[model samples]
Target: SAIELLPFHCPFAAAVNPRLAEIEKLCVDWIDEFRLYQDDAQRERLIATKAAEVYARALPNAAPERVADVAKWLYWGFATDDMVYDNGPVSVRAADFLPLIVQLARIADEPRSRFGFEIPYTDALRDLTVAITAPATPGQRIEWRSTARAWFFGMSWDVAYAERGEIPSLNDYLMMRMHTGGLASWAATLGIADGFELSARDADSPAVRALLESWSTFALIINDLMSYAKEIENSNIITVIARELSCSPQEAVPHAYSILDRISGLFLRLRADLLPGADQNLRALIAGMEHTWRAILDWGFTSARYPYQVFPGWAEQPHDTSPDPLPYPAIAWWWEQVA
Candidate 1:
């Protein structure tokens, strides 16, 4: 029989779905495999290649350059430490899902990649090939399939990478992975198409709306910091693209900090609304949020005191606590705290 339940109340404020369990499993497997890699750099690179291979297989029609772009974006956006905080299981108990995600991801593209078996060429792969390499119709997106393709495709890649111990810091991963597939891509595609609207109460309440907006923004800010090491280690496609495009990763830092600042302000506003009869469910949701926040600070982005060098107006804010973010980003760093 199941022994015990969580002492904390659940914030039933949002729709509770079965998919949450799947996401939880996907996350736990990520952390577990990440720790298994003794050689961090080696694990990181191999998994990245595996992820690229999967993307190439799933979307054969994409140009090699476009394939690589989507792959890196998929990796950083979906499968990383940041996912553990946002849209992840509430307790350590939920971590068991990690292994399942790895297995599913491994089989999704080259089901035999793990065993070094050959993938039979099929119509699906061939079609994907045409889609990627072909020119776009007038006014059509050159590489737009369902956003679900990118999200699930990337998650599968992440499951593979985490299995081998090669994953990046994930500021963009969770939001892009969890929300992007459905809502994120929808929003993006709609904006691309000129207009759209929310389908639920997330738009009705300013407080709830603000919380989600802040949640996404903060999740990404911390994600970048968490993946800093992997980013440097893999020097994956993004680095390559930056070089090809003649840009610096440094240029993006300010924009990232701005996102964080906005999120922090949301937190401040959330804290101010402690009125009588506040929904217990809302409180539970906030508590869940705090759980992830601590995970990021005390665990995931345990670097340089905070998530970023600056956030919005706080660009020059003092540490007031500690300086020199953790000198390293590794599983050992997390275990040290756990120990």
Candidate 2:
């Protein structure tokens, strides 16, 4: 029984659905554009094949595996890419039940695939998976979920947007990443079938909802910052030019920050949902979000080698915004508010 419960969670799926809705558009667009060259008819063919393989290998009892099959619909039901789990005590539930994620990387023409799906990230994902399976404290479940959250978020770049369709603008890509319509309905149906009320809130308080809403946004934003480089690395063409010809990292900074800033705006807007005089845990959640955002601030300074002022004279610019590339300055201002 313990082993059977090791993998395939659905509650986490429902809980995170609202936040995921915010990014669905981007995710879908990214996939579409990534594979713009292929005809729509052919696109469906490939992803459908992928879906069949994914569902076939999974155990019947693994709800997440089933959801993984459905989640493939987000990409037009293509089953070429692997949708491997990066956290929790996952099951090798069946002999052929390989992760859809591992399969994604092993798919053909990844250079031309919509998302930069690649080989199994056996080391990084498995390591995180073990940590989640290890023993933990009372409140640690959410932390583990956060690790899963980060893993899935990184996985956004794990597959190409379009197998052969026209590449979309950045905004379109963000939209698909946050879609809730299909995922929400799917999560609800699964919850009901499992005899659970899909509407039962995590803390059963508006405060908790608000807290999750905000913190999740912050986490998503921070994640985007951490994974940008990897997104390019998985690419075949655009990334090559961005990597080879860019006069400086400065040239790459705007597109990077553009993605970050848009997500930052999303996080800030979610604070409107906070209800005063709510549960302590709810308030703490908001505090945690602020804490996570600050952590990103610290990480950016150390990791990106980003200067404290906006870099002038760089051509790459954020949408309707300045072209300055001073990530540290933004970090400083952001954390200053929390302190």
Candidate 3:
């Protein structure tokens, strides 16, 4: 399915869940139970996104039931992105998105309520929140809910500009991308799926949070590149860069790769330093991050959601692979965290 992709000079080896089929079945069954799809076309399109494979690849070592819950969230998350944030009328207006998320976060906050709102996404989330909470530690539970809120809230940052037919500066957009990109939500899944809570010390540490935000920023670069290849569109990192600098998207591609290279290289250093003297729980969480970062790259090549998955049409490496920090407080701070 891949047409062309820059080679990923990543350290982590790939592993996939043995229960991919089962994980997928759980998601499909749950999607059916809630009627999340609006019509056959919508169902077909969402299925083509392959949420199950994404989570299964990302959470390769999780237990079947655990990964299954994650798979449901992945599928539902994509559906919500398309149905509400990306495609809905609220997609461009932060005001509308804010209230909508308020309602949805309330559902996430109180997932076990028996109130029957006729909304498919909210109804389905109730079931998922219950399942995820059952086995998750208090910390894991809080992380998931918080990250889910982060995802929705960051989306409003984009919407705020889009609503006025405006583009956010690259600096502001990068900070927003860290949350809008969904890596926090994805990272939070590791503990819930694999059955451990990140200790408060590690979770709250400057170094550990660096690992999460750095990769979160880098992984979204891949998403933006892939989205560009699929189709040049607004809110894409390439497009944003091009607009800001008054250049073509193709002209912006290499710079995007440079951004990826810097962060990916830094991820290696930050991770290597953090691994020493780390507890087993911390180590496992880092390993999950490794799998996730690589998995995001690999899956981007084959996903149907990003058709025509080839662009820039050539073999290339990082133009500048130095792990030096870019001079943005939001991102450059990641390097300050490195010992």
* C-alpha lDDT of all candidate models, in order: 0.36, 0.33, 0.76
Error of 3 at 130 (Å): 0.8
Candidate 2 residue 284 C-alpha distance from true site, Å: 2.7
Which model is ahead, 2 or 3, in terms of TM-score?
A: 3
Q: Which stretches of candidate 3 lie over 4 Å from their true place?
A: 1-7, 85-91, 113-118, 311-319
Q: Runs in model 2 with CA error above 4 Å?
A: 1-134, 137-157, 162-172, 176-275, 304-339
Candidate 2 residue-wise lDDT, 109-218, digit = tens: 12123333333333323332332223333234333333333433334442343322234333333333322112222222222212232123544444343334334433
> Can you give the TM-score per candidate against the true fold?
0.34, 0.34, 0.91
* Candidate 3: tens digits of C-alpha lDDT, residues 19-135: 988888887888888887989888878777787887777888888788888777777777887776556444456765676776777777677544433345887888888887777
- As a whole number from 0 to 100, the lDDT of residue 59 in candidate 1 is 32
Candidate 2 is scored at a TM of 0.34
lDDT of 1 by residue, 1-339 (tens): 011111111111222222333333443343233342335653454343343433333332323444443343333333333333244434322235445434333433333334333222222232332333243332223213434355445545454444555434344342333333233332222222222233335334665555544554455445444455444532232332234335665544443343344445445445455323345444444444444443333333323322332222212442221222222232112112110
lDDT value, residue 47 of candidate 3: 75
Instruction: Please give the lDDT score for candidate 2.
Output: 0.33
Count clashes in each candidate, considering only residues at least 3 apart in sequence or on different chains. Answer: 21, 58, 0
